[PDB]
Design an enzyme around this catalytic site. Sequence first.
Site, PDB file in Angstrom:
ATOM      1  N   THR D   1      -9.666  -0.220  -1.916  1.00  0.00           N
ATOM      2  CA  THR D   1     -10.584  -0.197  -1.261  1.00  0.00           C
ATOM      3  C   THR D   1     -11.678   1.435  -0.599  1.00  0.00           C
ATOM      4  OG1 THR D   1     -10.593  -2.492  -0.482  1.00  0.00           O
ATOM      5  CG2 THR D   1     -12.606  -1.210   0.692  1.00  0.00           C
ATOM      6  N   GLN D   2     -11.936   2.401  -1.208  1.00  0.00           N
ATOM      7  CA  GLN D   2     -11.954   4.278  -1.311  1.00  0.00           C
ATOM      8  C   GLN D   2     -13.080   3.540  -1.537  1.00  0.00           C
ATOM      9  OE1 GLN D   2     -10.588   4.497  -4.872  1.00  0.00           O
ATOM     10  NE2 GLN D   2     -12.517   5.829  -4.746  1.00  0.00           N
TER      11      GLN D   2
END
Lengths: 198, 198, 204, 233, 222, 212, 222, 196, 196
Positions: D1-2
């Site tokens: 979850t960048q």
Amino acid sequence: MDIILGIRVQDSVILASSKAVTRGISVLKDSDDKTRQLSPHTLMSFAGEAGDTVQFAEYIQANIQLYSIREDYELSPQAVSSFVRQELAKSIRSRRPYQVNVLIGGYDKKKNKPELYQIDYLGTKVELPYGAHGYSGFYTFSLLDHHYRPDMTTEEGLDLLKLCVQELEKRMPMDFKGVIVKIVDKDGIRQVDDFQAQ
Amino acid sequence: MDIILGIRVQDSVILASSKAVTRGISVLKDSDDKTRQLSPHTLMSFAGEAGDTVQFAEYIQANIQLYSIREDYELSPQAVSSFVRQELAKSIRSRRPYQVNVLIGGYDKKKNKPELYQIDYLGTKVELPYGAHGYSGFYTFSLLDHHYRPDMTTEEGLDLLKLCVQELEKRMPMDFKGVIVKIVDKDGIRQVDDFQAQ
Amino acid sequence: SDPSSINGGIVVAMTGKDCVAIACDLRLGSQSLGVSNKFEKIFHYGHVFLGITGLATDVTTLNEMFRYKTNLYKLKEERAIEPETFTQLVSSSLYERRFGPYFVGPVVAGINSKSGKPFIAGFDLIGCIDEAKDFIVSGTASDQLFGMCESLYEPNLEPEDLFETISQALLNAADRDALSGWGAVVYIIKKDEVVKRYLKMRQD
Amino acid sequence: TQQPIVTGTSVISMKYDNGVIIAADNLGSYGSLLRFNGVERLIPVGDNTVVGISGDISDMQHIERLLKDLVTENAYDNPLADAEEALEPSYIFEYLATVMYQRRSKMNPLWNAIIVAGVQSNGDQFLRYVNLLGVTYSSPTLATGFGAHMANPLLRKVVDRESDIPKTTVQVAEEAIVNAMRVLYYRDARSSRNFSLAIIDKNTGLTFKKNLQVENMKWDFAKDIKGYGTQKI
Amino acid sequence: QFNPYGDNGGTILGIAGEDFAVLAGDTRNITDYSINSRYEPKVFDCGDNIVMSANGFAADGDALVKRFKNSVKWYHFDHNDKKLSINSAARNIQHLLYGKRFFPYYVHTIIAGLDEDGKGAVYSFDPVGSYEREQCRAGGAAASLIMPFLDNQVNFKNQYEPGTNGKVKKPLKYLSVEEVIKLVRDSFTSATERHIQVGDGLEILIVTKDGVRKEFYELKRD
Amino acid sequence: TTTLAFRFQGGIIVAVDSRATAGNWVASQTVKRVIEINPFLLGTMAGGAADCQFWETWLGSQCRLHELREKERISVAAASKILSNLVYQYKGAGLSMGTMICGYTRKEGPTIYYVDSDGTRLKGDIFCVGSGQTFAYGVLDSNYKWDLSVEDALYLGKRSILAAAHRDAYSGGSVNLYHVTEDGWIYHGNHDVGELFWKVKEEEGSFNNVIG
Amino acid sequence: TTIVGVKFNNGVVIAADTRSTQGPIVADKNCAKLHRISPKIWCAGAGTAADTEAVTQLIGSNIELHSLYTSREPRVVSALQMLKQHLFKYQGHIGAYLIVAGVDPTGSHLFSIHAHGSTDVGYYLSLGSGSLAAMAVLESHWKQDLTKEEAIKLASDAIQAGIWNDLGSGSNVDVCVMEIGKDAEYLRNYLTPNVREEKQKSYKFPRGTTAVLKESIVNICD
Amino acid sequence: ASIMAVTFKDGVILGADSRTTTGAYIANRVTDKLTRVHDKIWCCRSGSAADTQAIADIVQYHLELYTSQYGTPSTETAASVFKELCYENKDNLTAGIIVAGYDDKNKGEVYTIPLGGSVHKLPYAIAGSGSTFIYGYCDKNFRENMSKEETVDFIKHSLSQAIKWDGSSGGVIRMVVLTAAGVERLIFYPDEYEQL
Amino acid sequence: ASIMAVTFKDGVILGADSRTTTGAYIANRVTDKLTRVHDKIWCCRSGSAADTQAIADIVQYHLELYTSQYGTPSTETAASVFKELCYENKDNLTAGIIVAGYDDKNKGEVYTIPLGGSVHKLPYAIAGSGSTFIYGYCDKNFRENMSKEETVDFIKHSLSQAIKWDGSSGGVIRMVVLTAAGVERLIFYPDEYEQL
């Protein structure tokens, strides 16, 4: 909530109304007449928000006892209904909205017929053979669907009413501490105080 | 929740346990034995979370019927208690915690005394003359304070029990559909099935 | 939750050869619970008809209100109000409460008595006038009705034919709709006669 | 979850009579700051595939080493690494597409839009798109991020349906692709004037043009624009 | 945050015949308000006379098709090239979908072919693998604009025999593959008009005892 | 959704609706809300469409596996406690099911267990579950003798489902009927609620406020 | 919605599509987005259907009354300033995005107004969901000093771009040509590219198909 | 946006880009961010186009009326009317403005009104989104009392940079020269300012 | 922070401020933001002091070990070890680094590693909080192949500005000159760089 019932028969209208008043944790009263008489032949039972409930029913009582007194004419049920409705519909887009549900039942002395009206806090109004607010309807509407004839004697209809209350005491989690049954007919508004054992 | 009561007298321990099982809107059963027998002279009533409740009481039943069978000795109440406690205290910092409250009551065949233990889902354990979980305590503890003597006959104590249930039916909003009263003494665990009219 | 769909119901309107039809279901319910099966959603004011779907206490309020407004147009203007006009009165009238709208989905249908021309139109809750030659739909089965109409419709249907067509569009949408049904009514409006048939449909 | 940082904008491409064309500007941007001005976002693989990448530049450089790495592997123990059993677009795609969807499904996606363009062993045009979610699709005309909105409509005015592809010369495709890049620089705020464009003909092979510039811009009319309504001077 | 899901739109419909079955889908593939392709097919031939379509989010459906097409390759190798019973692939798909029960393939998914008796069959799926066998089901965005119409013109609902008052239901007939094709391509030309996510192309796969055939029809491109 | 099951002299009746909805939209009315687990046991779908089909299908397996290993039929009590246990194992992972497991064995008699996502397991005589649960209960509660002709008690299920389909928007479609004897279960048809409503309004004189 | 405006030598022309979308559904496949403020001052509406109408009906009414007090032809730059300041009074809560153009005694004018009250003067402008498709056409084909027929092809070309390449726009092409000399010409449905191919069937029902319970005649006039 | 104003020997010069963006999209690439509130008193707009437009519009008036009654308005006064609007309405506005003008007494005068509503008199001032990148270039390359073409160049370079580095800035570079001899509008195109 | 690195004829020069702030408070006003990973390969740290420190510490190792086995490390390699750490750990780091060094073949080499973890080779690179203000000054005043003292000056000015305009930057200006003839550490004090 809070049990508000009513069934219109052949010669009258019948209103049931739970006797209990609950304030969160304790049951405060075991004997609450949840209904104001709007005039000789017109009754209104009600349930909903805490204070909002009574304060509304009494405002309507006043305003109908005033139209009665002024024109020395007993305002017809259809009209008392369509007035109460407007008064709710007015308050729904108001600042603090009356949060009240009601059943109006009375005898139209001019058609010599009984009438039952159902109105929710939004101003939603429709005329019925039988009706209810809150969840009261789910346990009881299946029985009425089945056992209701519109030619029912006032006696035949009290029987069918006890049967609904019985179902509500069986499959409903709330202890509503009984009902008060009131009847509206040609002779006016009387109350059957022999019910939880008739 | 869900009525869990218990009072320890002179010659025994008594457990009351609401008969109702409610799934949100409808009352599903009117006859629930909310108690597993942990062994000849040791009983455990319980209430709390939905599934968590039974699954725990049965796990304890197994583990105590196993220590019974293994050492052919009936594990003493103090011990069954302090074990059930540890099993809850273990699950409170676990992944999904058992959310269960319990009353353990039983006859210590070696001290020939009755014992009542109260344990909440957190592992909080204390020994009492009388006890209750949920809100059951508020309506009833005021009566017990007043009318309780520790020399009370088993009969004198059933009377005082009916008096608590009556107060709960009066000032409590839930329809709990009655109780089942069980008694634990030198002769073991028997159930009085004549209560809501004794 | 959503106001535009507590109560339920649908309304549909079409044109034919020198005629128009408007129809609805008789259902009124709080969420899942059906309460009345005799709650009509179509009202008339002179020779101009108005169906309104959505929130009951607002469907009712707007009827009560357009009766009032059109009754005074009749007295002040010496004539009965026209469909083209009434349409523009519903628009401005709805948009009056732009930032606190009546949660309704009105459909106007009727025949202009001077030009004999058929007329239908519909609105969103703040008064955008969708005028359309073909058909207008509205309700909790906004989608289903669009599906039926787009297939079953041809323009210039004779009246006795357009009843079969509009009835089948309404019926079959409400049967694929949870919050619509419980009866149905269908007004067929010729240049001077107006017939009102009730329909037989499932009751679930 | 960048979340993206250094990004590059649109990549645009269409197919034509023999080969395909793909282009993308040379800018990677730190937010609203046009930070890096020499970035190449066309990655050649062999001389039959060009891979165009928009999105997070760090994840792009990773995807670049994955292909430099995947070309090194192909050659191992394989006398036909520069012919028959050498790297095909359809492979390079199904590989990246497999990775992208694997990564989204481990909730740690590679933050990109990828357009794989090139010619196959058998002369077939190959053009397909895959993005950070794993979504894959193919049209006679594909563009990523911002180009999807302005670049497509212009290119689809050349190749609307498949029957239009053989009719499309190469100088026509290039002229239409260069137009779109100009239009992208009129209206895309995260765009550079410098771009790279690669053609992949089934006859001429890989023709890779570095260091191009948008020319022939029309701004004469701005002189005649004053005020914002009322103003005259 | 990162959001691993999409909508690519499109709309599929599967109909079970008496000696056949059709499984149709549109060719339009979208993201939000833009168009991605006008031709990128939705309905796939999987061998052993089974056609399927995993519609909703393309990446998840594309991936599920791949994974089943493969479940077939291995039911072959593992059970001596045996034919995959329609009813058995349905169940295998339930186990495929429910495998990712807590991170599902976001697809309403339909397969069509022939049951072991030769009659036509269609199966519909949740994203978590509830399956039932259906006469005709539509899935996708425009599901709601098709079903009512099909209920009426295929199962003759709310239709009565003229001049029988309303006591004799219009008698259910059974329809040539050519007739079902009529209703399919009118269900779609309709939807295309009132749904912005439908258009471009209509592709139908048709299963008979003779195998799988592809018919293709153009749709409005607006 | 409306599902109901009950015990009586002649075994167990199970009755369900078949409507399944995605909001206001009715996506199918061809739903098998009663799960033929194996020929001696039934489950009722209610809650999560897949979660029910799947774990009860799986139950059917673990049930066969149990009959081969012990050469004797599995008891309703233990069939249900396997499902209850498997499901409690996934507590609040987001499972949704509320089902009655029904069986008739030599040793237990007609036996009904209600099992749900929460981990609950309850032996009972009468259970209705789903949106229209309260409506069924109403009809069942008033007209339920124990010694009911297997034919009268099959009609009772047919009708407690009707009461519900009518009112509830989320129940309706058609009714599936099952009868459970010691020798196994017997399907009793699929009666479309459309046509059935009218048939009952006439013969019963009921539904009097429905103009037709 | 797609709308554009294009200035030419002796006037200005404005164009729009005809599709109104509530969510994903198409409610009017042909509502005119071309609004009249004064005889020779028209504007294109995109945003909340109701607000482009209402706020047009208004400024146009006030502007009509003003051309009468002043005994003077109404000017584009008036309708701009009154719209600008109205929308801004309303902190953007009024959802109108307009292209306002026309001819007055001062020449040809073309302006765009956004909901929060910003205005832009230009030679080519586009607003709405197809804004970007259209602006891509406009940026490629616009030279200074068009002709009446060139400038019309160009705006209609730019609306098409929207129709096709945008799911928010579609159906027909409305135009209005305001030449400096002449009256204004409003060509409703100047283009009709989206005509529904003839269905495969006709679903006219045999009379008597529908079951009737009760029938009666209502009375219309007293 | 991306704007600035510089004073010199002969007067004052205003400069700006022309790019108003909503999002990543350049809605207009030819914006006139140089707005006129009086013969020789102009502003530089940056922030909400709808807010800076409304204000300038309302100042243009206050000053047209001040002229009617009381006469020609000091450059100082134009600034006070801007501050009074921006400060007394801070809660509902997003506007940063540069007021610049020429009278005969003081010649070059420049007032920058940041977001707060504060007012600051200065020799030169930069503002708008893309200003952040040239605080460096400007403080190093600015001089008092520059010649006309010295100042045009100073502006052309400063703004050439701002646009290079800012995505929210670009278009053509507009200038407006305010001297005794009159008002001269300038424009420099991309083919020119990029090659610097 | 506020850091940069420049290449020239004789090698490469690293420059930085010395101000680490937590909040409005200058916790250390003499920070050594020039950190050494090898004889003639150094970095410029900016971002979390705890993150940039940990990384450089871990790179100093990787390279001490690379030297042990395989020999002297290309400046390129130092960069790759930084990128590999920063990129493969992006979710949990906030560090922007400039790696610079001198070998004999290429002489001046400079690699900037933004936050993403991307890597960019350049002639000069600026970074750190206060870089935003000198993108303008630098692009205009930088030249390739400068002389040693030409480059010291270019850095002194660029950083004199960044510190003027940034509150998160300041202290003394540290430099580190990397040439064949060795490592030379520079320092310039406030009384000096402000008067520019």
